[PDB]
Structure formats: C-alpha cells, structure tokens
C-alpha cells in the first residue's frame, strides 16, 4: 500500500505541481 500511496501522490503532483 506504500507504493500505491506514492503513486497517488505523484499523479496528484503532476496535476497540481505540489
């Protein structure tokens, strides 16, 4: 589940540029 969370965060970052 850790990688799955890094995955969600990265996809959000590409959108929002955190």
């Amino acid at each position: 589940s850790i990688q799955d969370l890094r995955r969600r965060f990265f996809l959000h970052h590409l959108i929002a540029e955190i």
Partner: antibody
Framework: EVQLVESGGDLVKPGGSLKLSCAAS????????MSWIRQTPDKRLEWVAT????????YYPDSVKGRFTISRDNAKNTLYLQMSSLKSEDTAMFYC???????????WGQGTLVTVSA | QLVLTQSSSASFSLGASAKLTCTLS???????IEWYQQQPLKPPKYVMD???????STGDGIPDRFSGSSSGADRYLSISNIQPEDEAMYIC?????????????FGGGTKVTVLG
C-alpha cells in the same frame, strides 16, 4: 472527445537531432501531466519522458536523460519532445499520452515514426 | 530492479475465459500496476489499474468482460467470453518514485490469439 495527434517523425542520421510535437484537443490541456512512450521494432514499450501540467517538473529514464527534453506550450495545447545525440537503437514509434487523476497514460495518440539510420 | 514478467504469447478458444499473468519482481510485490491492450497495427490503449488487493479501475469504454485480480506478486488480467476483437498484445506497466525520481517499466507483452 480527447484527441492527441503526434507529428514530426522522420529519418535522421545517427548523432542527429529531431523535435516531435503532439497537438491535443478535447480536454483542458493545462490541467494534466503529459508523457511520451516509444515502441521499438521488437514491439516493446518504453516510457520516455513525463512533464507536469505547468511544465515546472520533468522526468526521464536513464536511457534518454541528458539527450531528450520534454516541454509544452499551454497557450497552444501542444506537447514537444526535442531529441538529440540519436542512435540507431532509438528508432521507434513515439506516442504522446495524457494522465487521468488516477493513472499515468490514460489516452494515447496515433504515434509518429522516428527512424535513425545512415 | 523493478521488473514485470509476462509470457510472450497465449492462445484461447472463442468464448472461453482467459487469464493473463504479469509477475512483479519480489521486492515490489505490493505494487499497483497498469494493464494496456494493443490491437494489430494500432496504438496501445489503457485497460485498467490493478492493486495488490485485487481491486481495479477500468478505463473508459473497456468491456466489462475484462477484470483484474492479484495474488502476492502476480497481477492477472482475466477476459470472460473471449471474443475475436480481444485478439491483441496485452502489456503490463508499473511506476514508482524513488526520492524525487520517477521510473516506469513495461512488461514484454503477451500476444493473445483467439482460436476456433
């Protein structure tokens, strides 16, 4: 009706350069990360480059880092892949792809063929 | 090394249930992966996301005959009532960020033939 149309593929000599473009429509271009994925003659797929929605962040695998530059012009709904120091192993069909909030490469273009040869 | 292993080809009879396997390298057995489909002479397309627990999300317009499931390091794409248009190459993919670095890997793809 999401659409991605890549152009710019062509014959290039080894050591050469080539710039590909991807024209996008049917969605809000500036809200999404965009990427390039290539497919070589053996049919294997290889991720090439990813850029965040505003262009502030770019990602590349070792195979092309330093040689390939992904960029975009949000005012023109266009994505670009500038390539340099090309080798014959780089020959492949290059595709442009757009993310979804849940996945990386949800919609793909038709592809543009890059042939590196003497 | 992040590696996805898939058999290069597979055959199934029209109407049967098919199952394709993508196996993650051991250290990455908990990873969520993606499935893609590529029909002859055509662009690859997105099929679905598949998590370690077997939950999955299908792309727009994918037939419900396509479903995913998992078992440890294996990631499966199942196709019920396999049809002639399901004939294609199926490829799995998986991404991960290591520090501030992104890597994304594809499996070798499985060429699927529909017999009968």
């Amino acid at each position: 009706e999401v659409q991605l149309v890549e152009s710019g593929g062509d014959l290039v000599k080894p050591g050469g350069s080539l710039k590909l473009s991807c024209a996008a429509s049917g969605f809000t271009f500036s809200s999404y990360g965009m990427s390039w994925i290539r497919q070589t003659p053996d049919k294997r797929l290889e991720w090439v480059a990813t850029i965040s929605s505003g262009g502030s962040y770019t990602y590349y695998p070792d195979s092309v880092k330093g040689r390939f530059t992904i960029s975009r012009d949000n005012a023109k709904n266009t994505l670009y892949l500038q390539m340099s120091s090309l080798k014959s192993e780089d020959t492949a069909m290059f595709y442009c792809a757009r993310q979804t909030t849940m996945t990386y490469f949800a919609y793909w273009g038709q592809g543009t063929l890059v042939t590196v040869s003497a | 090394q992040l590696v996805l292993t898939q058999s290069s080809s597979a055959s199934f009879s029209l109407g049967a249930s098919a199952k394709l396997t993508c196996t993650l390298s051991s250290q990455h057995s908990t990873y969520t992966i993606e499935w893609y489909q590529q029909q002859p002479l055509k662009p690859p397309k997105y099929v679905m996301d598949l998590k370690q627990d077997g939950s999955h999300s299908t792309g727009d317009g994918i037939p419900d005959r396509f479903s995913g499931s998992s078992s440890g390091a294996d990631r499966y794409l199942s196709i019920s009532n396999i049809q002639p248009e399901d004939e294609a190459m199926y490829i799995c993919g998986v991404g991960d960020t290591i520090k501030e670095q992104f890597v994304y890997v594809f499996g070798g793809g499985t060429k699927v033939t529909v017999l009968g």
